[PDB]
């Protein structure tokens, strides 16, 4: 690609004095096509522009032609290439008589080239530009190239500082000089350009009127004629070399406005305050010169829009970019001081301060660590329960501490403080609500690869406290405790699905006798979670041996749950939830039933469980309306004694229509309601799904 183009330039440099008949022309001919195709990057141009002046074997006629045609730059052409051209520019003298003189026509052609590609010049560091501007002004005094650097000098000098009286004297004297024939035309535009920079400049208008001409040539001198073919290829070359850089439309536009500037001549650490900053684009230029006036009232108390208030929240952020964040930062102390006042109610009202500080404290997790660690105290809860609750919902689930990895021991003591606070108070239900946010935070710990075991250990201590008599009960309790517990089971269920986390399996496996509490409690939603957890657990624990503590308690759960749900053979079993079945018997004879045909079979089944008793009736009533049978089910509970008595009374009418089709007895009924319960989408589909797998009779109809 560009390596061969380097060789072509090197080919004209490696060989000298050969004087071939056509080999030199062929290399130049190869340079004609290679220059436009590959762009002649800046390092190549520096060697090429030095080669033309170094070697005089090639005629100056073709030296101008290659500058006009081959010099189509795609590179950055920094000041190093321009300095080499500046070295080529000049005239021989007594001091430089030994140095070979470059042709003046080649210098004029070279001066014509960078004018076309001035738009590609680097954005200067405003340190060597003063040297370059003086150099160009000194080079401007040569007549053969005065007509081409004159449009250039108009361009790089855009400031009142660049309008220097010593530069004014040189430009004016050349026009006043008789032996130029073009300086009065050249000086007039430069003086006009310098006029618009400094202002009125009554000294510059008295010089122009002395050097004024008939101004037809000035009109022609105002217009700068750049070759359209030169720019058309240049636009294509620039786009190809650098995609999404130097667009062709803007490259033509940038040249045009540089040309229009010449036409307009005839018609015509530094401290910057953050208070006055309004535009982010200006802020980008002001970034090296940004300075923040230290005022605490504003920088947090008032975006895609453009305004000073658009950068409002960014002001609190750019200072953290300007200087490293620290605990002594004024914005970081304002929130704590405002927070300190709001708990003590020394502020006017805490309601409006919270949303702004919460958003600030939502990010900057290292800062949020300081806020949470100091205000998580028992004493700070005594002042007001609601204000502690509000801040628990903002910064708890979004915090991931990595400073010491020893904050787990602080939470168990502090979490128990709220619980103990709720005991003697007598409930408020504020303990369960505060736990749910911690569970959200725990999953954030679980999501992170670090401290996976640390988070799981914290979760286990929650279940022991959550499963106490006063906070969790099947007789007198709150939905808050159960709804907090059902979310915890989903965390472990989701943890089982993840395979990228290689954690400790005893953490996933829940306690042996703690599942008797969840199973015995007749909360229909709670029982749904247990079936999901049991099914997901059995997906794992397959490589474990037949004899093991983890797999023995899992099989015990499956057998006990099915006996309590559908098997209806608890008495024949040896135990149920760690309780001997004969204990159940003793209660039964003490219980009274007006007509006890099958006393034992009514209580222990899917229909007899109080959690799933009435929802069983609801599904049946839906079936009766859909099928539109002759007789509806008048009873309120489904059991063996009601079903046969219902069929025995209407046995004459059973023979012709009976009941809903597809069912012959109660045993068929108990599944038919479950088929609908499994068919529809509802929270207790999970109950039927669990019972399908471990019923071996119905598993036959499934494939494999």
């Amino acid at each position: 690609m560009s390596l061969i183009l380097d060789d072509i330039i090197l080919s004209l440099t490696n060989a000298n004095e050969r004087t071939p008949p056509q080999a030199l022309k062929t290399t130049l001919s190869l340079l004609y096509e290679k220059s436009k195709q590959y762009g002649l990057s800046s390092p190549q141009l520096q060697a090429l522009v030095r080669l033309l002046c170094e070697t005089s074997i090639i005629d100056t006629v073709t030296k101008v032609y290659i500058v006009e045609n081959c010099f189509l730059p795609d590179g950055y052409l920094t000041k190093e290439l321009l300095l080499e051209i500046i070295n080529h520019l000049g005239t021989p003298t007594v001091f430089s008589r030994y140095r070979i003189q470059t042709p003046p026509v080649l210098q004029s052609a070279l001066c014509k080239w960078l004018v076309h590609v001035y738009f590609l010049f680097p954005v200067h560091s405003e340190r060597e530009h003063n040297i370059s501007s003086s150099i160009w002004l000194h080079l401007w005094q040569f007549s053969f190239l005065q007509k081409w650097i004159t449009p250039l000098v108009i361009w790089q000098a855009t400031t009142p500082v660049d309008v220097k009286p010593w530069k004014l004297s040189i430009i004016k004297r050349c026009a006043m000089h008789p032996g130029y024939r073009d300086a009065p035309g050249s000086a007039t535009l430069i003086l006009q350009r310098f006029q618009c920079l400094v202002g009125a400049s009554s000294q510059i208008t008295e010089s122009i009127i002395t050097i004024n001409c008939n101004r037809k040539t000035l009109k022609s001198h105002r217009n700068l004629k750049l070759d359209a073919h030169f720019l058309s290829i240049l636009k294509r070359i620039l786009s190809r070399a650098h995609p999404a850089n130097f667009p062709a439309d803007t490259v033509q536009n940038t040249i045009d406005m540089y040309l229009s500037e010449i036409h307009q001549l005839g018609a015509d650490d530094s401290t910057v305050s953050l208070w006055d900053v309004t535009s982010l684009e200006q802020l980008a230029q002001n970034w090296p010169q940004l300075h923040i006036p230290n005022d605490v009232d504003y920088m947090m108390k008032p975006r895609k829009v453009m305004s000073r208030d658009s950068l409002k929240h960014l002001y609190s952020s750019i200072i953290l970019i300007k200087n490293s964040r620290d605990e002594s930062s004024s914005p970081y102390e304002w929130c704590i001081w405002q927070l300190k006042r709001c708990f003590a109610h020394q502020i006017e009202t805490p309601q409006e301060v919270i949303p702004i500080i919460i958003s600030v404290s939502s990010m900057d997790n290292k800062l949020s660590s300081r806020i949470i660690q100091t205000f998580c105290n028992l004493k700070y809860l005594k002042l007001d329960e609601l204000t502690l609750k509000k801040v628990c919902g903002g910064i708890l689930p979004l915090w991931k501490p990595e400073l010491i990895s020893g904050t787990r021991e602080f939470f168990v003591k502090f979490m128990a403080s709220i619980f103990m606070w709720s005991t003697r108070d007598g409930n408020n239900c504020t303990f369960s609500e505060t736990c749910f946010y911690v569970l959200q935070m725990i999953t954030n710990w679980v999501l992170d690869d670090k401290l996976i075991a640390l988070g799981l250990t914290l979760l286990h201590d929650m279940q022991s406290l959550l499963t106490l008599d006063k906070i969790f009960n099947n007789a007198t309790s709150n939905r808050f405790s159960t709804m907090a517990f059902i979310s915890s089971l989903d965390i472990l269920t989701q943890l089982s699905k993840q395979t990228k986390s290689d954690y400790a399996i005893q953490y996933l496996i829940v306690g042996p006798d703690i599942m008797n509490k969840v199973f015995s409690s007749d909360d229909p939603l709670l029982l749904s979670a247990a079936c999901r957890y049991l099914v997901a657990t059995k997906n794992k624990l397959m490589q474990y041996p037949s004899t093991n503590k983890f797999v023995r308690m899992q099989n015990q759960y499956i057998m006990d749950l099915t006996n309590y749900l559908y098997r209806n053979k608890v008495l024949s079993s040896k135990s149920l939830f760690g309780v001997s079945p004969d204990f159940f018997k003793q209660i039964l004879e003490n219980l009274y039933i007006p007509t006890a045909d099958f006393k034992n079979a009514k209580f222990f089944t899917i229909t007899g469980i109080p959690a799933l008793s009435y929802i069983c009736i609801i599904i049946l009533r839906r079936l009766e309306t859909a099928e539109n049978t002759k007789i509806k089910f008048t009873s309120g509970i489904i059991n063996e004694e009601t079903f046969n008595n219902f069929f025995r009374v209407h046995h004459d009418e059973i023979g012709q229509h009976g009941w809903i089709k597809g069912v012959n007895n109660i045993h068929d009924l108990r599944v038919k309601i479950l088929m609908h319960l499994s068919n529809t989408a509802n929270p207790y589909r999970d109950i039927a799904a669990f019972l399908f797998t471990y019923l071996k009779s119905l598993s036959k109809y499934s494939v494999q």
């Binding site: 399996i505 005893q506 490589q543 041996p545 037949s546 004899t547 503590k549």
Partner: protein, 154 residues
């Protein structure tokens, strides 16, 4: 050995002999062996937990453990050791079909094991159950086990 709870060697499909030395606590329930695993030798091990096989025999027998303690009855002269005592399950009380079921239970935890060796142990927190086939071939080596009280052969 089971620091992470579970220990397996299934991926080592060609493993045949495993040697454990200078380990404090080893539980055989957590360890999972491959299909061709045949020999297991342990030396200078502090604590050992044998396979938890006793209750599985109890369920099949449906006999109380205290009553089962009255069931067992006290070639081995070639390799008798004073440290332990050899006890066997009685054949008169157990039916032949029932006895065959009892032997099959023991082999459930003895899938492909052929050689077992005990050397310099300190305590075993359960009854030691070994099949009659491995014991009668002198492939059960309870050596320097002065702390082991009894071993049951079924």
């Amino acid at each position: 050995i089971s620091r992470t709870g579970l220990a397996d060697f299934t991926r080592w499909d060609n493993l045949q002999k495993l040697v454990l030395s200078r380990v404090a606590y080893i539980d055989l329930n957590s360890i999972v062996f491959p299909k061709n695993f045949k020999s297991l030798t342990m030396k200078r091990v502090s604590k050992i937990k044998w396979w938890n096989i006793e209750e599985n025999i109890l369920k099949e027998l449906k006999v109380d453990k205290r009553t089962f303690k009255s069931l067992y009855i006290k070639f081995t002269k070639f390799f008798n050791l004073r440290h332990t005592r050899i006890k066997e399950l009685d054949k008169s009380e157990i039916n032949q079909i029932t006895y065959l079921r009892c032997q099959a239970i023991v082999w459930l935890s003895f899938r492909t094991l052929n050689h077992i060796k005990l050397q310099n142990v300190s305590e075993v927190f359960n009854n030691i159950i070994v099949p009659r086939a491995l014991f009668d071939s002198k492939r059960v080596e309870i050596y320097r086990c002065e702390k082991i009280s009894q071993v049951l052969v079924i």
